[PDB]
Amino acid sequence: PQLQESGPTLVEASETLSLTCAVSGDSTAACNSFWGWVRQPPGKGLEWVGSLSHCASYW
Amino acid sequence: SENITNNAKNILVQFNTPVQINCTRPNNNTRKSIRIGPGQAFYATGDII
Amino acid sequence: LTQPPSASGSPGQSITISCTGTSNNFVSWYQQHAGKAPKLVIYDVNKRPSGVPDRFSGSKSGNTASLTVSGLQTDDEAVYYCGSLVGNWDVIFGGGTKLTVLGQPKAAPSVTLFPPSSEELQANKATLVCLISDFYPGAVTVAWKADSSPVKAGVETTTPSKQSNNKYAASSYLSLTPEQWKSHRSYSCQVTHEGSTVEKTVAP
Numbered sequence: 001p002q003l004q005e006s007g008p009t010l011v012e013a014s015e016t017l018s019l020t021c022a023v024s025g026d027s028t029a030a031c032n033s034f035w036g037w038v039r040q041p042p043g044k045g046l047e048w049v050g051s052l053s054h055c056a057s058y059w
Numbered sequence: 060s061e062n063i064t065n066n067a068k069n070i071l072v073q074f075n076t077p078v079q080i081n082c083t084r085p086n087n088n089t090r091k092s093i094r095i096g097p098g099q100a101f102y103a104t105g106d107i108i
Numbered sequence: 109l110t111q112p113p114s115a116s117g118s119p120g121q122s123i124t125i126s127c128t129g130t131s132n133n134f135v136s137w138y139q140q141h142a143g144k145a146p147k148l149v150i151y152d153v154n155k156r157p158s159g160v161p162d163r164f165s166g167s168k169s170g171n172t173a174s175l176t177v178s179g180l181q182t183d184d185e186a187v188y189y190c191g192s193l194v195g196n197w198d199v200i201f202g203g204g205t206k207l208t209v210l211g212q213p214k215a216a217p218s219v220t221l222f223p224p225s226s227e228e229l230q231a232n233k234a235t236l237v238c239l240i241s242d243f244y245p246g247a248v249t250v251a252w253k254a255d256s257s258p259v260k261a262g263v264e265t266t267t268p269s270k271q272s273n274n275k276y277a278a279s280s281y282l283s284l285t286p287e288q289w290k291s292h293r294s295y296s297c298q299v300t301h302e303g304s305t306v307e308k309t310v311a312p
């Protein structure tokens with residue numbers, strides 16, 4: 001299982017930051033785990049971004 | 060009712076307005092589809108997610 | 109979640125780092141080597157993952173969660189973060205605890221404070237830099253004050269880095285306006301290392 005991040009390393013202010021992770025060795029369809037992001041500002045602590053999953057319920 | 064004063068006979072009722080009822084299976088399931096051949100395949104109940 | 113800023117130990121000794129604010133059992137700890145990605149060393153409190161030594165054990169008493177590392181070694185030197193589920197689905201992380209398994213010997217930090225220059229004031233800019241070095245462990249918090257009251261604005265502090273002599277060093281940058289620099293006579297810079305603090309002050 002390997003996670004490879006990709007996208008612009010340099011973005012201008014007030015613009016839209018876009019990043020894409022490419023998974024290898026596992027399926028995003030799998031209901032065993034959620035997929036999201038965690039950002040760590042330079043020389044600072046870990047901050048949670050968010051995660052989602054298509055594996056739903058009846059509502 | 061077939062016989063009303065008789066308590067042994069059931070009483071059938073007919074509604075005016077229909078009553079909304081919801082019945083769900085709050086278990087999201089999977090099918091194993093195990094192979095008990097030749098040619099036959101049984102559908103087992105897998106784990107509940 | 110509140111995680112202690114620093115933690116130190118000699119090889120073979122056992123270290124216990126705490127975390128508070130966890131009302132649930134969803135507590136988890138992480139290990140991040142400097143210049144690398146974080147790795148999960150524990151989950152569901154005490155339970156261990158694959159390829160993780162027995163010497164890492166999680167524990168939670170009351171509202172306090174605790175990690176314990178016995179038999180310290182070189183590869184254990186890193187920053188340790190704790191995290192847990194909160195409320196409905198949100199998750200938070202602590203400030204993290206920096207644990208160092210560096211070679212001997214322990215030593216008090218050293219502070220050298222430089223006031224803005226004359227050429228710098230000509231650019232209508234004022235910046236004071238605190239230089240802290242030669243300390244163990246490698247985690248130090250820095251504070252700023254003006255005359256008496258503390259300064260909460262313009263503070264930039266960065267994670268320390270190891271030197272050639274194996275002693276850690278860090279620098280905090282305070283950028284303000286020249287108006288408030290000439291008005292307030294003295295500027296104090298407080299550097300807190302393992303409880304004890306080291307202070308420096310400069311006035312024009």
Ligand SMILES: *[C@@H]1O[C@H](CO)[C@@H](O[C@@H]2O[C@H](CO)[C@@H](O[C@@H]3O[C@H](CO[C@H]4O[C@H](CO[C@H]5O[C@H](CO)[C@@H](O)[C@H](O)[C@@H]5O)[C@@H](O)[C@H](O[C@H]5O[C@H](CO)[C@@H](O)[C@H](O)[C@@H]5O)[C@@H]4O)[C@@H](O)[C@H](O[C@H]4O[C@H](CO)[C@@H](O)[C@H](O)[C@@H]4O[C@H]4O[C@H](CO)[C@@H](O)[C@H](O)[C@@H]4O[C@H]4O[C@H](CO)[C@@H](O)[C@H](O)[C@@H]4O)[C@@H]3O)[C@H](O)[C@H]2NC(C)=O)[C@H](O)[C@H]1NC(C)=O
Nearest residue numbers: 026027028029030031054055056057058059087088089108
């Ligand atoms: C209960 O639990 C189950 C799990 O047990 C949950 O089921 C999961 O539900 C999610 C959500 O729907 C599914 O994701 C969808 O995937 C389909 C494609 O599915 C096929 O491919 C999957 C991947 O296969 C690959 O990986 C596997 C594993 O590694 C590998 O083995 C395989 O070889 C291959 O390499 C397969 O897993 C999948 O199999 C499933 O279905 C089989 C029957 O087909 C069944 O036999 C299997 O057992 C298995 O269950 C299948 O082969 C995506 O197409 C789909 O994306 C659309 O749908 C979602 C909502 O469902 C939507 O949010 C997306 O935006 C997207 O909708 C857009 O695209 C559509 C066309 O692609 C289009 O029709 C839509 O109108 C829409 O288009 C519009 O919007 C977009 C922007 O959104 C716009 O760009 C367009 O222009 C347009 O305007 C889903 O992502 C899982 O696959 C499924 N199964 C599993 C195992 O996870 C279930 O959700 C739970 N809850 C309930 C209530 O059931």
Ligand SMILES: *[C@@H]1O[C@H](CO)[C@@H](O[C@@H]2O[C@H](CO)[C@@H](O[C@@H]3O[C@H](CO[C@H]4O[C@H](CO[C@H]5O[C@H](CO)[C@@H](O)[C@H](O)[C@@H]5O)[C@@H](O)[C@H](O[C@H]5O[C@H](CO)[C@@H](O)[C@H](O)[C@@H]5O)[C@@H]4O)[C@@H](O)[C@H](O[C@H]4O[C@H](CO)[C@@H](O)[C@H](O)[C@@H]4O[C@H]4O[C@H](CO)[C@@H](O)[C@H](O)[C@@H]4O[C@H]4O[C@H](CO)[C@@H](O)[C@H](O)[C@@H]4O)[C@@H]3O)[C@H](O)[C@H]2NC(C)=O)[C@H](O)[C@H]1NC(C)=O
Nearest residue numbers: 060061062063064065066067068069070071072073074075
């Ligand atoms: C659909 O469901 C409904 C209910 O859900 C079913 O309705 C049931 O229908 C059955 C009929 O099969 C009823 O049983 C019969 O009841 C009648 C009437 O009994 C009542 O009234 C009697 C007299 O009342 C009058 O006199 C008094 C005194 O003055 C007065 O105060 C009153 O206001 C009124 O003016 C009472 O004697 C009687 O009380 C007795 O019975 C009670 C019930 O058991 C009991 O609780 C009391 O304590 C007391 O013991 C009651 O209040 C009965 O007359 C009739 O009896 C016949 O059938 C039984 C078998 O069940 C049999 O053993 C008897 O011998 C009798 O058969 C005589 O009459 C036949 C017809 O004429 C005749 O062919 C026979 O040969 C026999 O006659 C012979 O003997 C007499 C002397 O004994 C003689 O003169 C003749 O010449 C001849 O030799 C039944 O018990 C149920 O009551 C009723 N259900 C309810 C809740 O009421 C219906 O069946 C269902 N239908 C379908 C299709 O599903």
Ligand SMILES: *[C@@H]1O[C@H](CO)[C@@H](O[C@@H]2O[C@H](CO)[C@@H](O)[C@H](O)[C@H]2NC(C)=O)[C@H](O)[C@H]1NC(C)=O
Nearest residue numbers: 032087088089090091093103104105106107108
């Ligand atoms: C129902 O019991 C079976 C075992 O009889 C479980 O299947 C095992 O699941 C574990 C995961 O913890 C695997 O390590 C084993 O290899 C599995 N064994 C077999 C024979 O499949 C199963 O997980 C249980 N129900 C579920 C799916 O929750």
